[PDB]
Design a protein around this nucleic acid. Structure first.
Lengths: 50, 75, 116, 177, 136
RNA sequence: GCCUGGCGGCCGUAGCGCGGUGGUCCCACCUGACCCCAUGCCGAACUCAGAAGUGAAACGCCGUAGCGCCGAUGGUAGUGUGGGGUCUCCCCAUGCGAGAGUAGGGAACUGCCAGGCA
RNA sequence: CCUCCUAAAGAGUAACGGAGGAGCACGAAGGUUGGCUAAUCCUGGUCGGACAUCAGGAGGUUAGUGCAAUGGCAUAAGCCAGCUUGACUGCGAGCGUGACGGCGCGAGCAGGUGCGAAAGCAGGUCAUAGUGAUCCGGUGGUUCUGAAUGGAAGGGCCAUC
RNA sequence: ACUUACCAACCCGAUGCAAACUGCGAAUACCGGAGAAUGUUAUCACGGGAGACACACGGCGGGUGCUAACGUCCGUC
């Protein structure tokens, strides 16, 4: 319902992104997580986008 | 007001005491841990009990609470 | 319930070691002493033991029940373990915190050459 | 401090004599002293509980623990987790220091002091008494109060019955009616 | 007219009335009316029999009712077709098996008890018999 | 042989209560708290350095059918197959046969290791 | 679509049969390490009332679980705190359930990572509802293709709306 | 605060009832292993071709209906 779809984009420039959801109303701060980037095969910071 | 039901889930003991099992075969499907896991038996995320080794299924009752355990005995 | 708390605190690690089928170096601790045993996977036979209440290591200690005593007991149990041929074991703190005398015994065993 | 070794010297001997105990450790020992306020009306404003905590810090040296409402009761408009009180637990040297600071100093300063109760022993050898004015305590200045709130002090013991609990507390010259 | 004060559910299945009665001995009083037959006992029937026997013994002795109607019985209205949901609750019954002691009685002579129980059994739909307290 | 500690087997015939009993070793409480470590306050607990005291509490052992627990035989209910009736429910032949209850039992039994005392 | 019952002690089983829910939520309400144990009542106690916090006692799960019901949960799956991103990528023996489309569980291997001294745990959450095939099309990546040749358009493959 | 011809929760003893209750619990059925005898392989897979998807009554176990119907809806023979 309220909880809207976003993508978390790699910070390695590979164009890889994960996709998730976020409640924008509560906790509006941008999401940031160490996720595995398979293009570079390293754990890298992924930042909220879209 | 009462014309509703859910698709039956086909839960239950899929493999009975003493039968031979290959590794990975589901023994019992269950809501909650009605059967607990013992030797060479793994518990799944939805509490499914499956064989972690090739063997024969064995049922037992163990522990202070008289709980039922599924074990696989290597043949 | 100072006892029952310790057993129900250790029970998860005890059980997990039982499913994994590991030879477990169980440590027991008390205000005056420290005990160590290595117990086979079946959980009903002791292969090697050690304790401050002995005479092999009791006269070389200012006071049984200090970190030096724990280190000595760890060295003794590790030495007799390697003598009897047991190398790879799993530590079982038995509900005591891995902080003080328990870790003293553990690192003594590690230095003496028990892989855990 | 003083009352510790006074207990060990005199009170142990007297209790041994007048209750014919077999072993020294049968004599009761004062375990702990718990001071508490139920703040009550401070659900609307948190500042009252902060003032109460400051009062506890003034009375007892250690800082207080804030207690939660533990459930929801529609009668008093509370819910699980709302701060509704503050408490301090006193053990050992600080317990004996507070026991001095109570029994010697605060006891003679009750308005129309008609003695003190004796039925209040919980039936198992533990005492509890409420003071109706925190200003009774010395460190609480008469000018640094925004609202008047009493408190409760509970003195526990290793006693087995109210009779020997009364004996131990009387051995410290506790007032009674 | 007896009825449960409340129930978990409003409508029970029909079920069956097989088997033999439990509670087949005069436990409270000295005399009792026992069921030889099998069937339902409606709350109206129970009230009718109770009224008859309480009139037979003009406010004297004590009377126990052992059977309580706790089963809802539904009936569909007239000019209505089959299906369209289960019918609405209309009355309550007690299933009676043979041997079930229905009423119990104390504090009266046996002749008056027999007369009162004849007047009561004239209102019930099942054959009954007179029984008396026994030891062991 | 007796006693204690650790880890198991079995999971109430093993528990809960009541009465007694033990400190040589062990265990328990216990003494102190700069430091190792910790309290959403408190050395209460966790933890460290010890050994003045007491087995008070806890713990182990022993006794006690107060409660829990276990529990026949016989009968009863139920039921597979075949047959019958007065067929909403029953009965006959044969095989299986409860639950509840009664009599009675019951104050667990046992394996490896270590220490003390014989 | 999910829970229970009818449903006749494996599965499955119908009616305009009897009763209730779902069309979400949460970057913590996930992972791991360490720790902890409820409801209710009884008694005593300042404002305190039958029911606010405190102290002890009986009690032993009559509590709790993000939301229905069932089944589970003390090693806790319930509560609290520290560090964290395994709500990872490729695969997957072998199973279960479907007419099929599909759905589900899964040890284990490779890579890289979090927590833990370590054994180890982690491929979201106590489990089971929280969903929509195909076609058309939009976005990011990918020189796979590119209608004379080099590009490019368009198309394919991967991620996603 | 006395008190009470009304009422009275808890607990204790006796007494029943339950599809959506279970501190118990069968007979049957079902799954698996081993062994004879018996049965025109009656089992499994793959391929060519179908038909059929209005069922009816009787017995037993039930929902619904009134343990009404040559009623209706399931299970099994």
């Amino acid at each position: 319902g309220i909880r809207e779809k976003i993508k978390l984009v790699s910070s390695a420039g590979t164009g890889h992104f994960y996709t998730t959801t976020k409640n924008k109303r509560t906790k509006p701060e941008k999401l940031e997580l160490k996720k595995f980037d398979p293009v570079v095969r390293q754990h890298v910071i992924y930042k909220e986008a879209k | 007001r009462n014309g509703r039901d859910s698709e039956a889930k086909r839960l239950g003991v899929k493999r009975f005491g003493g039968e031979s099992v290959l590794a990975g075969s589901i023994i019992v499907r269950q809501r909650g841990t009605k059967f607990h896991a013992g030797a060479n038996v793994g518990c799944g995320r939805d509490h499914t009990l499956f064989a972690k080794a090739d063997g024969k299924v064995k049922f037992e009752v163990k522990g202070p609470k008289n709980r039922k355990f599924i074990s696989i005995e290597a043949e | 319930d100072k006892k029952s708390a310790r057993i129900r605190r250790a029970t998860r690690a005890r059980r997990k070691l039982q499913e994994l089928g590991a030879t477990r170096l169980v440590v027991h601790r008390t205000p005056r002493h420290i005990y160590a045993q290595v117990i086979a996977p079946n959980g009903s036979e002791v292969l090697v033991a050690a304790s401050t209440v002995e005479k092999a290591i009791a006269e070389q200690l200012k006071y049984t029940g200090n970190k030096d005593a724990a280190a000595a007991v760890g060295k003794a149990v590790a030495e007799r373990a390697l003598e009897k041929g047991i190398k790879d074991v799993s530590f079982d703190r038995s509900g005591f915190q891995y902080h003080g005398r328990v870790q003293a015994l553990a690192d003594a065993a590690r230095e003496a050459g028990l892989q855990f | 401090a003083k009352l510790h070794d006074y207990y060990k010297d005199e009170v142990v001997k007297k209790l041994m004599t007048e209750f014919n105990y077999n072993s020294v450790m049968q004599v009761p020992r004062v375990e702990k002293i718990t001071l508490n306020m139920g703040v009550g009306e401070a659900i609307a404003d948190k500042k009252l509980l902060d003032n109460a905590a400051a009062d506890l810090a003034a009375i007892s040296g250690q800082k207080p623990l804030i207690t939660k409402a533990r459930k929801s009761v529609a009668g008093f408009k509370i819910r699980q987790g709302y701060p509704i009180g503050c408490k301090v637990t006193l053990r050992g040297e600080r317990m004996w220091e507070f026991f001095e600071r109570l029994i010697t100093i605060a006891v003679p300063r009750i308005r129309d002091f008609r003695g003190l109760s004796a039925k209040s022993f919980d039936g198992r050898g533990n005492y509890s008494m409420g003071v109706r004015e925190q200003i009774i305590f010395p460190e609480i200045d008469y000018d640094k109060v925004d609202r008047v709130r009493g408190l409760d002090i509970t003195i526990t013991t290793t006693a087995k019955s109210d009779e020997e609990g009364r004996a131990l507390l009387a051995a410290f010259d506790f007032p009674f009616r | 007219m007896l009825q449960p004060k409340r129930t978990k559910f409003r409508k029970m299945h029909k079920g069956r009335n097989r088997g033999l009665a439990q509670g087949t001995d005069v436990s409270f009083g000295s005399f009792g009316l026992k069921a030889v037959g099998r069937g339902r006992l409606t709350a109206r029937q129970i009230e009718a029999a109770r009224r008859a026997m309480t009139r037979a013994v003009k406010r004297q002795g004590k009377i126990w009712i052992r059977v309580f109607p706790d089963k809802p019985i539904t009936e569909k209205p007239l000019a209505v077709r089959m299906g369209k949901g289960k019918g609405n609750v209309e009355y309550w019954v007690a299933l009676i098996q043979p041997g079930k002691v229905l009423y119990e009685m104390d504090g009266v002579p046996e002749e008056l008890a027999r007369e009162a129980f004849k007047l009561a059994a004239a209102k019930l739909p099942i054959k009954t018999t007179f029984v008396t307290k026994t030891v062991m």
